[PDB]
């Protein structure tokens, strides 16, 4: 019954001092509800879930002001990080930022996080205590000394332990019909002859929420990882997710294999057979 | 989003 809220930020500079592309997204669990794209015409935070559209105009103005300040901060960071690593203006570089909070089934604070990355590599991250930093390299150590003197950790701790949790509860209440739900996976199995001596069984899991799920193949009731292929959990586009797992079996022995499905929306673990 | 603790590197 635990939940989470996360905010993702990306700023990608363009070649030759090109102004960055800025995209921000907000998630409640596995559900996106807000977005900001610097290439969009509105230049404002925009709703992506119905339960967030019931907020007032000052909510959207305030979120727009804060997210624009993020982009302007990343715009300065891209120039600063270009000097820290002695890089030229010809290339394109990326700043990523992610923070959020987890609450347990009692909706009480569980943990907070705030992570920063440059060109896909860890840069600086707030430790689990929300009081000390982890600097990946020497450039981030300079940033740590600046952020420690500016008391950034206690400011983020107040947001992660307070504002993040308080507004996560408000979201879980306003959109309880869609956020406090679990979609049990609808499952089926496909068969494909590979050669004269073997075939492929593929176990399907469709239209489930949240995205967390485990698919396990079994031969004679025993877990099997050999000759198996897992695919990454993917979105269906309607708010639900999909995943499949495959296994190559000897021809004529398809009936000896079972697919085990584990999902928090199922009232009981699910077992599939080729039929 | 955060209204504090967002500082330049």
């Amino acid at each position, epitope marked *: 019954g635990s939940h989470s809220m996360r905010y993702f930020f990306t700023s990608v500079s363009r070649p030759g001092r090109g102004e960055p592309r800025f995209i921000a997204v907000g998630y409640v669990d596995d559900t996106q509800f807000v977005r900001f794209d610097s290439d969009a015409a509105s230049q404002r935070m925009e709703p992506r879930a119905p339960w967030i559209e019931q907020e007032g105009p000052e909510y959207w103005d305030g979120e727009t*002001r804060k997210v624009k300040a993020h982009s302007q901060t990343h715009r300065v960071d891209l120039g600063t990080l270009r000097g820290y690593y002695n890089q030229s203006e010809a290339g394109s570089h990326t700043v990523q930022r992610m923070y959020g909070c987890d609450v347990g089934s009692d909706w009480r604070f569980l943990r907070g996080y705030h992570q920063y990355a440059y060109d896909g590599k860890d840069y600086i991250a707030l430790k689990e205590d929300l009081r000390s930093w982890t600097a990946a390299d020497m450039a981030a150590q300079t940033t740590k000394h600046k952020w420690e003197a500016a008391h950034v950790a206690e400011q983020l701790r107040a947001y992660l332990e307070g504002t993040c949790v*308080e507004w996560l509860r408000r979201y879980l209440e306003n959109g309880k019909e869609t956020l406090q739900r679990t979609d049990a996976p609808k499952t089926h199995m496909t068969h494909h002859a590979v050669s004269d001596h073997e075939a492929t069984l593929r176990c399907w899991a469709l239209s489930f929420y949240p995205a967390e799920i485990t698919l396990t193949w079994q031969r004679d009731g025993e877990d099997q990882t050999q000759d198996t292929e897992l695919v990454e959990t993917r979105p269906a586009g309607d708010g639900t997710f999909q995943k499949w797992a495959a296994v190559v079996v000897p021809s004529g022995q398809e009936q000896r294999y079972t697919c085990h499905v584990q999902h928090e929306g199922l009232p009981k673990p699910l077992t599939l057979r080729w039929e | 989003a*955060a209204g*504090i603790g967002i500082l330049t590197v």
Partner: T-cell receptor, first 102, second 111 residues
Framework: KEVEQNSGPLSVPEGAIASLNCTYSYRGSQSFFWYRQYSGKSPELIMFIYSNGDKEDGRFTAQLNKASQYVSLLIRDSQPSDSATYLCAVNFGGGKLIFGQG | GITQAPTSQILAAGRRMTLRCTQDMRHNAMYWYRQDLGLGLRLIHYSNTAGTTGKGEVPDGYSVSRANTDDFPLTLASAVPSQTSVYFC???????????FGQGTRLTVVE
């Protein structure tokens, strides 16, 4: 004014308790500040508070209640140097730091 | 620290005036206020970072520029007697943090 304080002027004798409150309209505000200003001088910060609850610093106690959008400042053992104009500041997102009427 | 200049000015109506404000504390956010009796401080313009500005509560009649991190001047395009006030510059580490104010400018516009 999107930020309002209790109307003055207020008067308290030395050694007594002084109390000032402050309300704001933006429910999503995340930082709140109490400033002190002497006559013909610059605003000087007394305390800041981010989270709900009480925050004590010497003779000063600040209280924040986001649900009721309410900020207050309690001054114990009022000193002659406490005589000033007290300014409540609330950040409405970004660099939109809005003050009260004092 | 943060310094503000000039600290006193008398302006004829219609003249243009620019107040200086410089800050060497490596602060990103800078602010401009005016103080009037019964209204406290009123946000004129602000700047989250170097290179960006934003309108406050009383933007009309004023303009700013933030070419770099240090400087954040305030310009009165055409002086109006209603712009007679006390102006305060201020800066903070980032948006949402505590502002440090300058000395203040007493400015009177007369017809």
């Amino acid at each position: 004014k999107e930020v309002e304080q209790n109307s003055g002027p207020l008067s308290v004798p030395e050694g007594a308790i002084a109390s000032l409150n402050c309300t704001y309209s933006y429910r999503g505000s995340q930082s709140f500040f109490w400033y002190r200003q002497y006559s013909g001088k610059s605003p000087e910060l007394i305390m800041f508070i981010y989270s709900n609850g009480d925050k004590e610093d010497g003779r000063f106690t600040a209280q924040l209640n986001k649900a009721s959008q309410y900020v207050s400042l309690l001054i114990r053992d009022s000193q002659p140097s406490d005589s000033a104009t007290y300014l409540c500041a609330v950040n409405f997102g970004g660099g939109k730091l809005i003050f009260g009427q004092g | 620290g943060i310094t503000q200049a000039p600290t006193s000015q008398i302006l004829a109506a219609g003249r243009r005036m620019t107040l200086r404000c410089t800050q060497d504390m490596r602060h990103n956010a800078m602010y401009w206020y005016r103080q009037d009796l019964g209204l406290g401080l009123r946000l004129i313009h602000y700047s989250n970072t170097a290179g960006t500005t934003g309108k406050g509560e009383v933007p009309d009649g004023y303009s700013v520029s933030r070419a770099n991190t240090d400087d954040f001047p305030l310009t009165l395009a055409s002086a109006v007697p209603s712009q007679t006030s006390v102006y305060f510059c201020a800066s903070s580490w980032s948006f949402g943090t505590e502002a440090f104010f300058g000395q203040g400018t007493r400015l009177t516009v007369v017809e």
